[PDB]
Amino acid sequence: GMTQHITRMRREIDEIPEAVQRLLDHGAQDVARVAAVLRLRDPSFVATVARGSSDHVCTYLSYAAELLLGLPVASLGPSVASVYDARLRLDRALCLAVSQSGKSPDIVAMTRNAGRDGALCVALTNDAASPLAGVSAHTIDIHAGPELSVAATKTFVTSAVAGLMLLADWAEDDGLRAALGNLPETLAAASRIDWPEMRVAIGARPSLFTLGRGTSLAVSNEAALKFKETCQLHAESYSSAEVLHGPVSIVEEGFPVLGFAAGDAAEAPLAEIADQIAAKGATVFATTGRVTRARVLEHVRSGHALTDPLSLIVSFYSMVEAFASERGIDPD
Amino acid sequence: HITRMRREIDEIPEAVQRLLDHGAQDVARVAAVLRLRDPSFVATVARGSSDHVCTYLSYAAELLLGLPVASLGPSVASVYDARLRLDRALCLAVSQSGKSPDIVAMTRNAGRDGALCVALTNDAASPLAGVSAHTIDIHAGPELSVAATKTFVTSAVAGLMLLADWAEDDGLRAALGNLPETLAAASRIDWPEMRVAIGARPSLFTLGRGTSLAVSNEAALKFKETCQLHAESYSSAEVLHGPVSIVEEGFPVLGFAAGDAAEAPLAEIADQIAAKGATVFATTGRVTRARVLEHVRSGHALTDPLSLIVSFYSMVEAFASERGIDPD
Ligand SMILES: [Cl-]
Ligand SMILES: [Cl-]
Ligand SMILES: [Cl-]
Ligand SMILES: [Cl-]
Ligand SMILES: [Cl-]
């Protein structure tokens, strides 16, 4: 009938592909200009400033910068500025600040101090007129549009895409630029996956372990965050290289395990651990054809190692929304 | 009949004294190298509890020396074998055994790529030592318990000694020098009221702000490892904004506050949470709603967290032994 029965979370997941398209179209110029400044200034290291889901974006971008450009990336605790007002040596540094609204006093303070202390500050934000924009040398509008879902899926995806576009223009990497260019298609496909077998597993045992290795650890961390946020159920993210050596036995917990595998150098080791876990009797799923014991999760590859995780997180978001809506949990 | 964990905690003060006695020359040598090298940044390489030590040392280096500190994901070397730009950097690797192939690989590659690699380890003959330019033996000695309490304290102390000598910081050196006395005092505290709260509602939330977040993180880890009960560590500036309501969970909250600029904001958030009905304890006499936890100050802001974590280890050991939990 006339009453619509689509959650805000789902509405925003179905807007992710076009949001990325708007960022690719409308943000291309600003991104190219900042990349030109970076090639000229030629900084020798990167500092990131962020909190919450924005910090998972920063983790993603830290792997991307290190793998593409070889630049070491330091995550700066905002208290260094906001509590201690320490003087840092940031000449020759890019400071990358990531924040949906750009209002957080701590993020603004750290970004302001970074500039004072020599860094070229670039903000990735959904509000170009925010306080953060005002303390940065450059602002890249992520073109996420208004978020009404607490999942804030558009903000995560577009933040990461904005940072990847910058890195790709800075590195002058045509393979990555091509993959980025095709993301709306890839993400559209990814949003049509909702992993019914995982939803049944979680319904049976309602907590979740996520795994990542290398770059995909950033989306594994994001996935655990948003699962807690939207479903009010417990989740924990681990490196697949550390999961078998932590405080608690993952297998003894009896909860489903989801391995985030991108088509990169970490795909094989992730698959290997996923299978080892499944061989102990645990319920394990992984986003790769390489697993022989763990269950293969439907996924869409992107054309490049660094864009692959964005496709996986879109599929995850879609799984979580379906899980919640069919159980009468409106995330919002 | 004391537990191995209690015996381990009791050994902490002497272990720190041996580090001061037998590690001072090695630390002074490396500090002299660094002081003249004047690296523009620091990278850290660690996993598990050693990564909490790295967090602690990251804050210490930023606040003392103004150098930004980058935590390097070991897969960058072990999986991707990426070429990094680490010219002139200090790369600090922290590992009890120094055997982890990922830690060894990231450190080896850090050196390959220009960093001066310094290992803080309990085994000077380990593979990690073998790929480092300098090795500082932490003098932790054998781990007696899964809590691995000496390893954490001595690793941090070794890092702090290095930073204090590099910075030529008399006040920090003084505090470090008195650590065995401070930590002996700290080990005699076991927070009985906290144990009652945790017994009643057996999960724990720990908080820190700035430097003390390192020990907050360590605390949650070791509570989980020793007791097999859930714990999670948050920045006090973020705890009221996370995906799950801390007050609504109904579990005790432990605020770690050092005698630094973060003490007041930690105490304020601790009181806000307490004002909402949660059971909150904090290591500061500045809270007026949350309960004050007995604690020993050390003579320097940067050494204060080591006192707090020793008291915490003592509380956990008492909590576990009383309830029939044998961590070991
Ligand atoms: Cl923010
Ligand atoms: Cl990893
Ligand atoms: Cl290790
Ligand atoms: Cl008490
Ligand atoms: Cl903090």
The structural domains of chain A, with segments of one domain joined by +, span 1-193, 194-329
Q: Which residue type is seen at A212?
A: G
**3-class secondary structure, B107:** helix
What is the sign, positive or negative, of the torsion defined by CA atoms of B85, B90, B96, B98? positive
Token code pair at residue B283: 């290591």
Cβ contacts (< 8 Å) between A242 and chain B: which residues? Answer: 47-48
Distance in angstroms (rounded) separating the CA atoms of residues A31 and A38: 11
With both helix axes pointing from N to C terminus, report the angle between B149-167 and B213-227 in degrees, rounded to the nearest 10: 160
CA of B79 from ligand 1 middle (Å) equals: 32
Distance in angstroms (rounded) separating the CA atoms of residues A41 and A240: 37
Token code pair at residue B311: 């008291």
Dihedrals phi, psi of A87, to nearest 5 degrees: -95, 115
CB within 8 Å: A84 and B261: yes
Token code pair at residue A132: 């953060």
Whole-angstrom CA distances from B296 to B182, B187, B233 are 7, 10, 22
Token code pair at residue A144: 């996420």
**3-class secondary structure, B206:** strand
Q: Which helix (H) or strand (E) holds B141?
A: none
Strands across the sheet containing B69-71: B69-71, B42-45, B90-95, B116-121, B134-137
Question: Would you call A329 an interface residue with chain B, using a CB distance cutoff of 8 Å?
Answer: no
Would residue B148 be called left, alpha or beta, if left means φ above 0 and alpha means ψ between -120 and 50 degrees? left
Within a 13 Å sphere around the CA of B80, how many CA atoms are in the beta-carbon half?
A: 24
Dihedrals phi, psi of A302, to nearest 5 degrees: -105, -15
Distance in angstroms (rounded) separating the CA atoms of residues B234 and B215: 11
Closest to A157 in 3D by CA, of A62, A71, A165? A165
CB within 8 Å: B84 and A63: no
Cβ contacts (< 8 Å) between A84 and chain B: which residues? Answer: 63, 210, 260-262
**3-class secondary structure, A94:** strand
Q: Do the domains spanning B1-189 and B190-325 agree at the CATH topology level?
A: yes
Q: Across-strand partners of A140?
A: A124
CB within 8 Å: B221 and A247: yes
Strands across the sheet containing B291-292: B231-235, B204-208, B253-255, B280-282, B291-292
Q: Which residue type is seen at A138?
A: H
Question: Would you call B210 an interface residue with chain A, using a CB distance cutoff of 8 Å?
Answer: yes
Residue A232 is nearest to which of B43, B244, B260, comparing CB atoms?
Answer: B244
Domain range B190-325, CATH architecture: 3-Layer(aba) Sandwich (3.40)
Question: Would you call B288 an interface residue with chain A, using a CB distance cutoff of 8 Å?
Answer: no
Distance in angstroms (rounded) separating the CA atoms of residues B151 and B216: 16
The CATH fold assigned to A1-193 is Rossmann fold (3.40.50)
Interface of B with A in 87-126 (CB under 8 A): 87, 89, 102, 113
Question: Would you call A172 an interface residue with chain B, using a CB distance cutoff of 8 Å?
Answer: no
Q: Across-strand partners of A236?
A: A209
CA of B54 from ligand 5 middle (Å) equals: 15
Contact A86, A112 (CB under 8 A): no
Q: Which residue type is seen at A173?
A: D
Domain range B1-189, CATH architecture: 3-Layer(aba) Sandwich (3.40)
Distance in angstroms (rounded) separating the CA atoms of residues B320 and B145: 13
Contact B144, B123 (CB under 8 A): no
Dihedrals phi, psi of B271, to nearest 5 degrees: -70, -40
Residue of B nearest to A119 (CA): B68
CA of A10 from ligand 1 middle (Å) equals: 23
Distance in angstroms (rounded) separating the CA atoms of residues B275 and B254: 15
Q: What does this entry list as its resolution, in Å?
A: 1.8
Distance in angstroms (rounded) separating the CA atoms of residues B274 and B284: 14
Contacts across the A-B interface (CB distance below 8 Å): 126
Exp. method: X-ray
Place of tokens 């073998």: B130
Would residue A92 be called left, alpha or beta, if left means φ above 0 and alpha means ψ between -120 and 50 degrees? left
Question: Would you call A292 an interface residue with chain B, using a CB distance cutoff of 8 Å?
Answer: no
The Cβ of residue A188 has, within 10 Å, a number of other Cβ atoms equal to 17
Residue A70 is nearest to which of B41, B47, B82, comparing CB atoms?
Answer: B82
Answer whether CATH 3.10.180.10 is correct for domain A194-329.
no
Residue of B nearest to A270 (CA): B79
Token code pair at residue A256: 């489903």
Contacts of A181 (CB under 8 A, 6+ apart): A24
CA B127-B166-B176 angle, 5° bins: 85
Contacts of B149 (CB under 8 A, 6+ apart): B5, B8, B9, B12, B222, B310, B313
